[PDB]
Design a binder for this molecule. Structure first.
Ligand SMILES: [Zn+2]
Ligand SMILES: [Zn+2]
Lengths: 152, 114, 493, 141
């Protein structure tokens, strides 16, 4: 858990009277199957599990979308952010943009059950399955459409 | 009376709005009695962005730097008025004009007022 | 100690320190500081003896740390021991030695690597050059917090002589700063200015002036954040900060502390490396009384002659603006300059080198601060890995914005690794650079005068004073924001 | 006093903190301090998980204060014919406060805050409650 700093110093900052809001609307369309991992501790039969809503719709969560936005912004600027949790807000160019961004959590109309994939690992010496290396995976199909809304 | 020692004035000066992390030309020398270029100059001096200095001819015949200020908006009959954006460049060019009169940096201009 | 056998406390404590382990990762070093704090909190007179011996041992063994990575990881945790020894010690000169031993310990090692690369190049020891490149690469990785797969290599040090304070020339004054965090946190003043006048009899040569730095640090942080977000709308906060300098350090404008019209050498500490101390504002500005010069640390003091080469160069990549005064000087101008041209000029040891380009200080990692050259940025990392560099005694004028700025963060050790600092680590004679954004017209008109009148110390002061008379007529914050950023770094012969 | 009924409608799934014993609801518990921006669980009786969720009025108050800072920034401090001072966010007995502000405060004037013994306080200081006694009281949701 992030620990806030109680010796942090106080600052007043102007930012100015000029302030605009931009709204972007669209769709995010699955061109491949996809996997947002989330395990139910009470469901043991399946090893790797997909995130669903309580009524079994597929969910594109806000947390993942923000994480991917921050990752791609650091890819654009080509400079990683090193800041730790806690203390005064980070002033790097990515954090300043992310502090203006808002994104909707989204879900699908499609609600059919996921696929189950077999997966295994091969021992390279013998050419046969390694000890213990049999497992299975839930996968969400391609073609699902999610609403997308971003604001800055 | 035409401006003495005209050899030393610049041909043109070009002032430009500065930049960091919009041009105006002048012919380098003006002669004036106590109109486009005059209004252009008046615009810059009202903007407040040119340093300047003056010479005055003392009774012994030599030009001396005047103790005076060109406030916005004596017996003497002619003035040499030197202007530059750079304070230190002005202090150099005023020396050059003192030597010329009693026997320039690129952004310096001269005005001869009569 | 619990048995009040104080002579045996002295004996065992001395025996423990004398046999201390080399590695600062060892838990011994935590226990020693806890022991000294226990003695101090019980108000035992033993605490001052033990603290000074502990500092001397710690100082002895910092010398054996092999690279900046281990230096940042493990030695950085021993700062509190220097605070304690600084409080134990009563002699002002010895206080100054304790203070100075904490400063610019990473820059010293970068300087020694730059020296090593010279010898490798002239002897074509290629495999040593690769080792030198690996250490800088791993240091760059460590400042990004990355995991290091291989143990970084170790380098023995240069001939680190202890510089006598007497080597300051007779007409100067030196001000040494120290910010004692422990004393500050306990509610004391915590800020100290140690002032050396070499013209007085030896018993009167040192003064120790102390001040409270909490509010000055707050106003610094406030200006810094407003600068990052606005930026030139921060001019009023700059004026506020410069007035706060004089509020915190009223002794700067007293002749019995700093005698009349003698030049001053600053040796800052902590966030004081970031401030324009030359612009402290009583209206009266400090630069009207004294000319100023900066060093990161006193053990870096090394006067050498200016370069003999009858050649100078101006490199420009700045096409928005016409530098009419610089481009009509006697120095030839090449534009638009690429990093290859900069690398070419840097191995000719020019008398004067001018660079006119945009610049940008990084927000996270110092090594990513850069100059904006034609088709590619040149970073501090690039400068510190140029194979062939010859700048001993050169004079360097950086027209770039933020060329003397560092990230808005506090690193684990005292350090100022700006672009100007990078050039100083290559043994440049003196560097002129900007603490924040610089105006192109002011750059033109200042550097033209400096190039014409080749005495930077006096000529920068004359330029600053000549601009101040236009400040007084209206006290415009925007004009002060344009005069203030320039400062000189280094101390030539 | 006059009462203003309010309701909050969520458009997304909201987050909720894990319930903790009263010996652990203090500044030295990282888990409790991290959860202070979420909803809460209330147990009807401490030895049973049976309960229901709720939101503190303090959290809504903090969000409203941030919103008021932004609005006053856009109006250059004007609200009707009145003008707001910078507010006051400075407490001498720090250890009273479970949380301390880490972000910077938005600025719209150089003027100092209202005196602590004044009779008349600007609207922002009324909203801060600076004018057992409340002027604007936020209940739980
Ligand atoms: Zn960041
Ligand atoms: Zn108020």
């Amino acid at each position: 858990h992030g620990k806030p700093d109680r010796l942090e110093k106080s600052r007043s900052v102007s930012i100015g009277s000029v302030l605009k809001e931009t709204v972007v609307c669209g769709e995010l369309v699955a061109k491949t199957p996809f996997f947002f991992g989330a395990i139910d501790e009470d469901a043991k039969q399946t090893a790797l599990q997909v995130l669903l809503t309580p009524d079994n719709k597929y969910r594109l969560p806000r947390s993942a979308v923000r994480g991917i936005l921050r990752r791609d912004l650091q890819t654009y600027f080509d400079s990683p952010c090193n800041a730790e949790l806690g203390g005064r807000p980070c002033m790097c160019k990515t954090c300043r943009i992310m502090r203006g961004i808002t994104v909707m959590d989204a879900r699908s109309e499609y609600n059919a059950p996921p696929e189950i994939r077999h997966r295994t690992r091969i021992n390279p010496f013998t050419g046969t399955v390694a000890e213990g290396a049999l497992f299975n995976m839930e996968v969400a199909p391609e073609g699902i459409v999610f609403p997308f809304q971003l604001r800055y | 009376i035409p401006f003495p020692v005209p050899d030393i004035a610049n041909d043109e000066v070009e002032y430009q709005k500065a930049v960091g992390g919009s041009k105006v030309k002048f012919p380098g020398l003006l002669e004036i009695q106590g109109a486009a270029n005059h209004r252009k100059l008046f615009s810059i001096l009202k903007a407040g962005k040119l340093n300047s200095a003056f010479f005055i001819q003392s009774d012994d015949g030599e030009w001396v730097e005047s103790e005076s200020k060109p406030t916005m908006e004596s017996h003497h009959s002619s003035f040499v008025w030197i202007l530059d954006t750079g304070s230190m460049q002005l202090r150099q060019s005023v020396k050059c004009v003192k030597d010329a009169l009693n026997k320039l940096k690129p952004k310096t201009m001269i005005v001869w007022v009569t | 100690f619990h048995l009040n056998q104080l002579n045996d406390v002295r004996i065992y404590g001395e025996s423990a320190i004398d046999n201390a382990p080399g590695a600062f990762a060892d838990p011994f070093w935590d226990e020693l500081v806890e022991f000294i704090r226990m003695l101090r909190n019980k108000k035992s007179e033993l605490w001052k003896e033990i603290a000074i011996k502990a500092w001397d041992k710690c100082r002895e063994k910092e010398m054996k740390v092999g690279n900046n990575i281990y230096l940042s990881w493990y030695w950085a945790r021993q700062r509190e021991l220097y605070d304690l020894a600084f409080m134990a010690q009563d002699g002002i000169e010895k206080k100054t030695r304790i203070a100075d031993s904490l400063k610019s310990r990473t820059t010293l090692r970068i300087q020694e690597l730059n020296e090593l690369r010279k010898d490798a190049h002239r002897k074509q020891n290629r495999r040593l050059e690769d080792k030198l490149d690996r250490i800088i690469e791993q240091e760059n990785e460590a400042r990004d917090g990355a995991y290091l797969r291989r143990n970084p290599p170790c380098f023995t040090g240069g001939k680190r002589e202890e510089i006598p304070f007497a080597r300051l020339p007779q007409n100067w004054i030196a001000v040494h700063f120290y910010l004692n965090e422990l004393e500050s946190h306990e509610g004391g003043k915590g800020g100290h200015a140690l002032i050396y006048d070499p013209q007085k009899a030896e018993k009167d040569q040192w003064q120790d002036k102390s001040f409270d730095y909490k509010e000055l640090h707050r106003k610094f942080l406030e200006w810094q954040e407003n600068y990052i977000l606005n930026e030139e709308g921060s001019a009023d906060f700059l004026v506020t900060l410069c007035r706060e300098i004089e509020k915190a350090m009223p002794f700067l404008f007293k002749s019995e502390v700093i005698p009349e019209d003698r030049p001053v050498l600053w040796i800052p500490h902590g966030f004081l490396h970031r401030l324009p101390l030359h612009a402290a504002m009583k209206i009266e500005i400090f630069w009207e009384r004294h000319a100023s010069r900066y060093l990161p640390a006193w053990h870096l003091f090394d006067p050498a002659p200016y370069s003999r080469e009858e050649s100078s160069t101006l490199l420009k990549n700045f096409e928005e603006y016409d530098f009419q005064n610089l481009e009509n000087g006697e120095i030839e101008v090449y534009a638009p300059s690429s990093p290859k041209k900069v690398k070419e000029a840097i191995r000719e040891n020019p008398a004067i080198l001018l660079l006119l380009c945009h610049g940008e200080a990084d927000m996270t990692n110092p090594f990513r601060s850069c100059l904006k050259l034609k088709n590619k940025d040149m970073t501090i990392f690039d400068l510190l890995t140029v194979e062939d560099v010859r700048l001993s005694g050169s004079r360097i004028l950086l027209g770039a914005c933020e060329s003397d700025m560092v990230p808005p963060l506090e690193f684990s050790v005292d350090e100022h690794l700006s672009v100007s600092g990078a050039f100083l680590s290559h043994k440049a004679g003196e560097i002129v650079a900007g603490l924040w954004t610089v105006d192109s017209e002011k750059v033109d008109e200042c550097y033209s005068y400096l190039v014409e009148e080749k005495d930077f110390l006096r000529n920068l002061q004359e330029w600053q004073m000549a601009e101040t008379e236009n400040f007084r007529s209206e006290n415009d914050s925007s004009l002060f924001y344009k005069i203030a950023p320039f400062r000189i770094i280094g101390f030539p012969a | 006093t006059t009462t203003m009924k309010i309701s909050i409608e969520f458009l997304e799934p909201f987050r909720m903190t894990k319930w903790q014993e009263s010996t652990r609801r203090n500044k030295n518990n990282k888990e409790f301090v991290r959860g202070q921006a979420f909803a809460r669980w209330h147990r009807n009786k401490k030895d049973n998980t049976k309960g229901r969720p709720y939101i503190t009025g303090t959290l809504l108050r903090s969000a409203v204060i941030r919103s008021a800072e932004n609005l006053l920034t856009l109006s250059d401090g004007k609200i009707s014919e009145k003008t707001c001072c910078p507010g006051k966010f400075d407490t001498e007995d720090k250890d009273r406060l479970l949380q301390l502000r880490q972000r910077s405060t938005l600025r719209w004037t150089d003027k100092n805050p209202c005196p602590d013994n004044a009779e008349t306080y600007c609207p922002f200081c009324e909203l801060l409650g600076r004018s057992w006694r409340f002027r604007i009281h936020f209940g739980n949701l």
